[PDB]
Amino acid sequence: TAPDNLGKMGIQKTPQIQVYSRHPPENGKPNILNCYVTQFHPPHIEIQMLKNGKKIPKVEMSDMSFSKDWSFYILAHTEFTPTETDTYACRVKHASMAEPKTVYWDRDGGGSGPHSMRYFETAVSRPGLEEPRYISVGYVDNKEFVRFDSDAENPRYEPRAPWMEQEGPEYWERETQKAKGQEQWFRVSLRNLLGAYNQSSHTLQQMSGCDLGSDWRLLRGYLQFAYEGRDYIALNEDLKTWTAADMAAQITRRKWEQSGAAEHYKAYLEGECVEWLHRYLKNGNATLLRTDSPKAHVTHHPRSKGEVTLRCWALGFYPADITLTWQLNGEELTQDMELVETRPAGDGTFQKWASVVVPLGKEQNYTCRVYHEGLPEPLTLRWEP
Ligand SMILES: *[C@@H]1O[C@H](CO)[C@@H](O)[C@H](O)[C@H]1NC(C)=O
Ligand SMILES: *[C@@H]1O[C@H](CO)[C@@H](O)[C@H](O)[C@H]1NC(C)=O
């Protein structure tokens, strides 16, 4: 259930690109190629996937999520069957870069833990058009489940997970009406903010949600806003007081203090947010509460006559929480270890790898350990000659 805002309001980051396959690539066998682009702002971006320099058709996109620091995520993926000589790339156009960036494919909560709900709301003012584009994405445990997009010919909240088909029409009508309210709220706020910062594209973001534990009781609630991808105002953990990021947001804070806005959101986070997440978790039991254990292996990458890189892979796991660690004769090497952010592999599962540089001839004294709730015991494995 989406939040409902009350009183209104009173820079570029270059993307990071990762290109990888869902399964270990075998020539002539079906697979999925992923292009995972993160940490960029503004959200507008153009992504193409290439095979031998040719645009690949029917590329799917997971759109319009963002992280705690307000920078945007996107996942582009397409099924493909690789062969030995083909070359594959991902080409990204973003306003933070002078020219397009091409990255080539190198062939070398959830479950039983805590749970959370989030609504990621973004309005972007467009120069050639009147109204801003307003998008709302709802998430349960890293899984998109609802979406509203004002660029739709008939804008409406739509189900994005199969267990939301269960909700009757009055649910969708009620959520959609909230979205239209939010759209007006964001539109007038964008106009106020343009004056407040004395400006002449612009972005306004909201993130709201509740965190639950394993007992499914409220751990913490959030309600935070950003302008131009930078903190503006956030509701503190007490759900009573506000933290303002600059002098403009201080004016908004005192206005929202006079009007008791914090209590309106406190009631949503403590009651509605918690109770309907419970229902979503139970309706989506088979999907959200499953555990898929990781399959793990170690690869060998010589770099000179004296040194080699060992990379510990974990594939096909759900939920996303996982711990990869390297050890040398029993003691852990976390400080001198190279990791990659846990990444989605395009089918509901996730991937991660961790690497160390070791002297050639001592590979057998290094061990990788994998911790995952889907594993009855932690996995221990080492490079196999
Ligand atoms: C999920 O479904 C199974 C089978 O229907 C049931 O036994 C289990 O208790 C359910 N889990 C939760 C958390 O509702
Ligand atoms: C390293 O590996 C070898 C091979 O098993 C072993 O003999 C040795 O005790 C291990 N540990 C150290 C500290 O050398």
Side-chain angles (χ1 to χ4, degrees):
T1 163
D4 190 352
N5 284 2
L6 273 195
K8 294 131 186 69
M9 303 300 209
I11 308 176
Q12 283 160 349
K13 288 170 77 173
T14 70
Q16 313 299 288
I17 307 162
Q18 301 186 36
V19 184
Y20 50 93
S21 52
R22 160 67 180 90
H23 304 93
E26 303 193 66
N27 290 328
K29 301 185 182 177
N31 203 325
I32 306 166
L33 186 60
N34 294 273
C35 178
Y36 187 45
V37 187
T38 66
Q39 300 220 253
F40 59 96
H41 197 280
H44 177 82
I45 196 173
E46 302 178 6
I47 301 172
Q48 310 183 5
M49 310 199 63
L50 304 176
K51 170 184 181 180
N52 297 313
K54 268 167 294 186
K55 300 166 86 282
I56 293 176
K58 280 201 282 187
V59 172
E60 311 287 298
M61 316 270 274
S62 164
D63 198 16
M64 217 54 68
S65 197
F66 56 86
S67 62
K68 193 180 196 305
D69 62 29
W70 304 105
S71 59
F72 288 88
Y73 295 116
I74 187 177
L75 175 61
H77 64 266
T78 175
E79 298 153 356
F80 78 128
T81 302
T83 68
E84 183 63 19
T85 58
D86 293 324
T87 187
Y88 292 93
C90 184
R91 208 188 77 116
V92 176
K93 272 183 177 174
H94 194 258
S96 64
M97 303 181 294
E99 64 193 297
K101 180 64 169 301
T102 294
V103 180
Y104 281 85
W105 175 50
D106 192 336
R107 293 170 170 80
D108 307 329
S112 79
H115 302 287
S116 65
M117 187 164 63
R118 294 291 190 274
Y119 282 82
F120 301 98
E121 306 183 46
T122 302
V124 170
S125 60
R126 294 172 293 187
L129 294 93
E130 315 124 303
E131 286 217 49
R133 179 177 192 183
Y134 168 85
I135 308 184
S136 175
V137 192
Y139 270 83
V140 171
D141 290 352
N142 236 346
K143 165 71 185 176
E144 176 176 337
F145 77 113
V146 290
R147 176 183 292 252
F148 180 95
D149 189 337
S150 58
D151 264 15
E153 52 170 271
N154 178 17
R156 159 200 160 87
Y157 260 121
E158 298 286 355
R160 301 298 285 183
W163 43 265
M164 285 299 289
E165 309 290 345
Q166 186 171 338
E167 300 294 354
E170 49 280 26
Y171 177 88
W172 301 108
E173 176 60 29
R174 191 167 58 250
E175 294 299 303
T176 299
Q177 198 62 30
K178 282 191 265 176
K180 305 226 171 187
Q182 295 293 87
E183 191 177 7
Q184 178 178 305
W185 191 94
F186 279 68
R187 179 174 43 85
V188 309
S189 289
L190 280 166
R191 266 195 309 278
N192 298 340
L193 288 168
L194 201 73
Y197 290 90
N198 204 12
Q199 293 161 303
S200 72
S201 192
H202 305 278
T203 316
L204 176 64
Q205 286 160 283
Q206 177 182 344
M207 195 222 73
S208 327
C210 42
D211 285 0
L212 306 190
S214 304
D215 72 335
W216 292 25
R217 287 187 183 171
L218 177 68
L219 272 170
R220 194 203 170 119
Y222 304 88
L223 184 97
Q224 316 170 331
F225 297 83
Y227 187 50
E228 314 286 41
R230 309 190 321 192
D231 289 344
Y232 184 85
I233 192 179
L235 183 59
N236 291 335
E237 189 195 355
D238 58 357
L239 308 177
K240 288 172 185 291
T241 62
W242 303 91
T243 292
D246 62 10
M247 198 171 309
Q250 291 289 341
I251 303 167
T252 292
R253 184 195 48 152
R254 100 181 76 260
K255 178 205 176 301
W256 290 4
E257 287 168 345
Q258 290 169 304
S259 68
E263 214 187 50
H264 169 87
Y265 298 112
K266 171 180 161 68
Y268 163 80
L269 296 168
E270 277 178 348
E272 199 185 335
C273 194
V274 164
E275 278 304 294
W276 283 83
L277 179 55
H278 286 177
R279 173 176 165 78
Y280 301 148
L281 292 169
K282 296 200 123 63
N283 280 345
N285 178 354
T287 286
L288 300 170
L289 306 177
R290 78 187 203 273
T291 70
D292 295 322
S293 49
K295 303 183 173 186
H297 67 292
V298 180
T299 61
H300 190 272
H301 310 271
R303 48 199 280 111
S304 74
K305 294 189 184 180
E307 286 185 348
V308 65
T309 301
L310 302 176
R311 180 168 285 107
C312 188
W313 290 84
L315 314 169
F317 58 96
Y318 181 93
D321 213 277
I322 195 173
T323 301
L324 294 196
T325 187
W326 275 100
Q327 313 185 342
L328 173 53
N329 294 317
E331 63 189 15
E332 297 168 2
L333 311 170
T334 42
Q335 64 290 347
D336 47 4
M337 188 193 308
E338 208 143 330
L339 309 92
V340 62
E341 301 279 358
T342 300
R343 58 199 188 182
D347 61 2
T349 59
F350 296 88
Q351 302 178 359
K352 199 186 184 62
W353 61 257
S355 70
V356 291
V357 177
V358 314
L360 184 274
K362 302 189 173 64
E363 298 93 324
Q364 57 286 344
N365 287 90
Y366 293 81
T367 66
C368 174
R369 210 146 302 184
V370 181
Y371 305 85
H372 195 262
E373 83 184 64
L375 286 166
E377 298 97 358
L379 295 174
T380 316
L381 60 157
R382 68 189 73 201
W383 155 245
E384 173 64 31

mmCIF file of all heavy atoms in Angstrom, residues 169-187:
data_model
loop_
_atom_site.group_PDB
_atom_site.id
_atom_site.type_symbol
_atom_site.label_atom_id
_atom_site.label_comp_id
_atom_site.label_asym_id
_atom_site.label_seq_id
_atom_site.Cartn_x
_atom_site.Cartn_y
_atom_site.Cartn_z
ATOM 1 N N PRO A 169 -10.489 -5.301 -7.731
ATOM 2 C CA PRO A 169 -10.412 -4.000 -8.416
ATOM 3 C C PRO A 169 -10.422 -2.810 -7.473
ATOM 4 O O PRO A 169 -9.835 -1.771 -7.801
ATOM 5 C CB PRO A 169 -11.652 -4.005 -9.323
ATOM 6 C CG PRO A 169 -12.055 -5.452 -9.432
ATOM 7 C CD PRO A 169 -11.677 -6.074 -8.128
ATOM 8 N N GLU A 170 -11.085 -2.920 -6.320
ATOM 9 C CA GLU A 170 -11.112 -1.808 -5.376
ATOM 10 C C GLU A 170 -9.728 -1.519 -4.814
ATOM 11 O O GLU A 170 -9.422 -0.368 -4.484
ATOM 12 C CB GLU A 170 -12.103 -2.098 -4.248
ATOM 13 C CG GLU A 170 -11.957 -3.477 -3.612
ATOM 14 C CD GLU A 170 -12.608 -4.586 -4.428
ATOM 15 O OE1 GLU A 170 -12.737 -4.423 -5.658
ATOM 16 O OE2 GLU A 170 -12.990 -5.620 -3.844
ATOM 17 N N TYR A 171 -8.883 -2.541 -4.695
ATOM 18 C CA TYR A 171 -7.491 -2.306 -4.335
ATOM 19 C C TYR A 171 -6.822 -1.385 -5.350
ATOM 20 O O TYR A 171 -6.243 -0.352 -4.991
ATOM 21 C CB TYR A 171 -6.741 -3.637 -4.238
ATOM 22 C CG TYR A 171 -5.268 -3.473 -3.947
ATOM 23 C CD1 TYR A 171 -4.810 -3.395 -2.642
ATOM 24 C CD2 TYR A 171 -4.334 -3.383 -4.979
ATOM 25 C CE1 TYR A 171 -3.466 -3.234 -2.365
ATOM 26 C CE2 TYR A 171 -2.986 -3.220 -4.709
ATOM 27 C CZ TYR A 171 -2.560 -3.148 -3.400
ATOM 28 O OH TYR A 171 -1.223 -2.986 -3.118
ATOM 29 N N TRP A 172 -6.903 -1.745 -6.634
ATOM 30 C CA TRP A 172 -6.193 -0.997 -7.668
ATOM 31 C C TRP A 172 -6.750 0.409 -7.814
ATOM 32 O O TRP A 172 -5.992 1.370 -7.995
ATOM 33 C CB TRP A 172 -6.258 -1.761 -8.992
ATOM 34 C CG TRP A 172 -5.652 -3.107 -8.845
ATOM 35 C CD1 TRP A 172 -6.298 -4.307 -8.813
ATOM 36 C CD2 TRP A 172 -4.264 -3.389 -8.640
ATOM 37 N NE1 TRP A 172 -5.389 -5.326 -8.623
ATOM 38 C CE2 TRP A 172 -4.135 -4.786 -8.514
ATOM 39 C CE3 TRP A 172 -3.116 -2.596 -8.563
ATOM 40 C CZ2 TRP A 172 -2.905 -5.404 -8.315
ATOM 41 C CZ3 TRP A 172 -1.895 -3.211 -8.366
ATOM 42 C CH2 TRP A 172 -1.799 -4.602 -8.242
ATOM 43 N N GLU A 173 -8.073 0.552 -7.719
ATOM 44 C CA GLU A 173 -8.674 1.879 -7.773
ATOM 45 C C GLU A 173 -8.195 2.741 -6.614
ATOM 46 O O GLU A 173 -7.880 3.923 -6.796
ATOM 47 C CB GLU A 173 -10.198 1.762 -7.769
ATOM 48 C CG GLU A 173 -10.918 3.098 -7.720
ATOM 49 C CD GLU A 173 -10.585 3.994 -8.900
ATOM 50 O OE1 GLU A 173 -10.283 3.464 -9.991
ATOM 51 O OE2 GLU A 173 -10.625 5.234 -8.733
ATOM 52 N N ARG A 174 -8.110 2.158 -5.419
ATOM 53 C CA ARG A 174 -7.695 2.916 -4.244
ATOM 54 C C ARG A 174 -6.226 3.318 -4.333
ATOM 55 O O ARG A 174 -5.865 4.451 -3.993
ATOM 56 C CB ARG A 174 -7.965 2.089 -2.986
ATOM 57 C CG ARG A 174 -7.825 2.837 -1.673
ATOM 58 C CD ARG A 174 -8.427 2.035 -0.514
ATOM 59 N NE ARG A 174 -7.809 0.717 -0.366
ATOM 60 C CZ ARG A 174 -8.416 -0.437 -0.634
ATOM 61 N NH1 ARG A 174 -9.674 -0.452 -1.057
ATOM 62 N NH2 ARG A 174 -7.763 -1.581 -0.473
ATOM 63 N N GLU A 175 -5.363 2.403 -4.783
ATOM 64 C CA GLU A 175 -3.953 2.745 -4.936
ATOM 65 C C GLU A 175 -3.754 3.781 -6.035
ATOM 66 O O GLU A 175 -2.978 4.731 -5.868
ATOM 67 C CB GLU A 175 -3.131 1.489 -5.230
ATOM 68 C CG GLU A 175 -3.085 0.495 -4.084
ATOM 69 C CD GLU A 175 -2.463 1.077 -2.830
ATOM 70 O OE1 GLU A 175 -1.306 1.537 -2.898
ATOM 71 O OE2 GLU A 175 -3.138 1.084 -1.778
ATOM 72 N N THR A 176 -4.452 3.620 -7.163
ATOM 73 C CA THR A 176 -4.304 4.565 -8.267
ATOM 74 C C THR A 176 -4.689 5.978 -7.843
ATOM 75 O O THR A 176 -4.013 6.948 -8.207
ATOM 76 C CB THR A 176 -5.142 4.115 -9.464
ATOM 77 O OG1 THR A 176 -4.693 2.827 -9.901
ATOM 78 C CG2 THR A 176 -5.011 5.099 -10.616
ATOM 79 N N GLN A 177 -5.764 6.117 -7.068
ATOM 80 C CA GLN A 177 -6.168 7.444 -6.614
ATOM 81 C C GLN A 177 -5.090 8.088 -5.745
ATOM 82 O O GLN A 177 -4.861 9.301 -5.825
ATOM 83 C CB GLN A 177 -7.494 7.360 -5.859
ATOM 84 C CG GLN A 177 -8.202 8.694 -5.730
ATOM 85 C CD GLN A 177 -8.574 9.296 -7.080
ATOM 86 O OE1 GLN A 177 -8.819 8.576 -8.050
ATOM 87 N NE2 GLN A 177 -8.614 10.623 -7.145
ATOM 88 N N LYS A 178 -4.418 7.294 -4.907
ATOM 89 C CA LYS A 178 -3.266 7.809 -4.169
ATOM 90 C C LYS A 178 -2.177 8.301 -5.118
ATOM 91 O O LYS A 178 -1.590 9.370 -4.910
ATOM 92 C CB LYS A 178 -2.710 6.734 -3.235
ATOM 93 C CG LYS A 178 -3.505 6.547 -1.944
ATOM 94 C CD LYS A 178 -2.759 5.665 -0.945
ATOM 95 C CE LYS A 178 -3.196 4.212 -1.037
ATOM 96 N NZ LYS A 178 -2.406 3.333 -0.123
ATOM 97 N N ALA A 179 -1.897 7.529 -6.171
ATOM 98 C CA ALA A 179 -0.856 7.906 -7.121
ATOM 99 C C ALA A 179 -1.159 9.250 -7.776
ATOM 100 O O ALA A 179 -0.277 10.109 -7.892
ATOM 101 C CB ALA A 179 -0.700 6.814 -8.178
ATOM 102 N N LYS A 180 -2.406 9.449 -8.211
ATOM 103 C CA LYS A 180 -2.782 10.723 -8.817
ATOM 104 C C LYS A 180 -2.625 11.872 -7.830
ATOM 105 O O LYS A 180 -2.204 12.972 -8.210
ATOM 106 C CB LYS A 180 -4.215 10.649 -9.342
ATOM 107 C CG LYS A 180 -4.431 9.499 -10.309
ATOM 108 C CD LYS A 180 -5.198 9.937 -11.543
ATOM 109 C CE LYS A 180 -5.208 8.847 -12.602
ATOM 110 N NZ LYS A 180 -5.819 9.332 -13.869
ATOM 111 N N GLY A 181 -2.963 11.641 -6.559
ATOM 112 C CA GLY A 181 -2.659 12.630 -5.537
ATOM 113 C C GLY A 181 -1.177 12.935 -5.454
ATOM 114 O O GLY A 181 -0.768 14.100 -5.440
ATOM 115 N N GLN A 182 -0.347 11.886 -5.400
ATOM 116 C CA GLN A 182 1.103 12.082 -5.365
ATOM 117 C C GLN A 182 1.588 12.868 -6.577
ATOM 118 O O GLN A 182 2.472 13.726 -6.458
ATOM 119 C CB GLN A 182 1.821 10.733 -5.295
ATOM 120 C CG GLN A 182 1.561 9.936 -4.025
ATOM 121 C CD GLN A 182 2.139 10.598 -2.786
ATOM 122 O OE1 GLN A 182 1.491 11.436 -2.155
ATOM 123 N NE2 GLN A 182 3.363 10.221 -2.430
ATOM 124 N N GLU A 183 1.017 12.594 -7.751
ATOM 125 C CA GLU A 183 1.454 13.272 -8.967
ATOM 126 C C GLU A 183 1.273 14.782 -8.851
ATOM 127 O O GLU A 183 2.165 15.554 -9.226
ATOM 128 C CB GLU A 183 0.686 12.716 -10.165
ATOM 129 C CG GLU A 183 1.229 13.133 -11.516
ATOM 130 C CD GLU A 183 0.471 12.491 -12.666
ATOM 131 O OE1 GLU A 183 -0.555 11.823 -12.412
ATOM 132 O OE2 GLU A 183 0.901 12.652 -13.827
ATOM 133 N N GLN A 184 0.130 15.222 -8.324
ATOM 134 C CA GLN A 184 -0.078 16.651 -8.110
ATOM 135 C C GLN A 184 0.865 17.192 -7.041
ATOM 136 O O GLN A 184 1.423 18.285 -7.191
ATOM 137 C CB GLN A 184 -1.534 16.920 -7.725
ATOM 138 C CG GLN A 184 -1.825 18.383 -7.429
ATOM 139 C CD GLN A 184 -3.281 18.639 -7.093
ATOM 140 O OE1 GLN A 184 -4.180 18.296 -7.862
ATOM 141 N NE2 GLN A 184 -3.522 19.245 -5.935
ATOM 142 N N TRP A 185 1.057 16.434 -5.957
ATOM 143 C CA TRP A 185 1.967 16.849 -4.893
ATOM 144 C C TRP A 185 3.379 17.072 -5.429
ATOM 145 O O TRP A 185 4.010 18.098 -5.148
ATOM 146 C CB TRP A 185 1.968 15.797 -3.781
ATOM 147 C CG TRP A 185 2.668 16.233 -2.530
ATOM 148 C CD1 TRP A 185 2.097 16.808 -1.430
ATOM 149 C CD2 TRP A 185 4.072 16.128 -2.244
ATOM 150 N NE1 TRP A 185 3.059 17.072 -0.481
ATOM 151 C CE2 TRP A 185 4.279 16.664 -0.957
ATOM 152 C CE3 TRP A 185 5.172 15.633 -2.953
ATOM 153 C CZ2 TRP A 185 5.538 16.720 -0.364
ATOM 154 C CZ3 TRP A 185 6.425 15.690 -2.361
ATOM 155 C CH2 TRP A 185 6.596 16.232 -1.080
ATOM 156 N N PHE A 186 3.898 16.109 -6.196
ATOM 157 C CA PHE A 186 5.236 16.252 -6.763
ATOM 158 C C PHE A 186 5.304 17.425 -7.730
ATOM 159 O O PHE A 186 6.295 18.166 -7.749
ATOM 160 C CB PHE A 186 5.651 14.957 -7.464
ATOM 161 C CG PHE A 186 6.171 13.900 -6.535
ATOM 162 C CD1 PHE A 186 5.328 13.270 -5.631
ATOM 163 C CD2 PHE A 186 7.507 13.524 -6.571
ATOM 164 C CE1 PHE A 186 5.805 12.288 -4.773
ATOM 165 C CE2 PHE A 186 7.991 12.546 -5.720
ATOM 166 C CZ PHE A 186 7.134 11.926 -4.817
ATOM 167 N N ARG A 187 4.253 17.622 -8.528
ATOM 168 C CA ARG A 187 4.269 18.678 -9.536
ATOM 169 C C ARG A 187 4.335 20.059 -8.895
ATOM 170 O O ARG A 187 5.120 20.914 -9.322
ATOM 171 C CB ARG A 187 3.045 18.564 -10.443
ATOM 172 C CG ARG A 187 2.966 19.647 -11.514
ATOM 173 C CD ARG A 187 1.805 19.392 -12.464
ATOM 174 N NE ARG A 187 0.600 18.983 -11.747
ATOM 175 C CZ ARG A 187 -0.266 19.834 -11.209
ATOM 176 N NH1 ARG A 187 -0.050 21.137 -11.314
ATOM 177 N NH2 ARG A 187 -1.339 19.388 -10.569
#
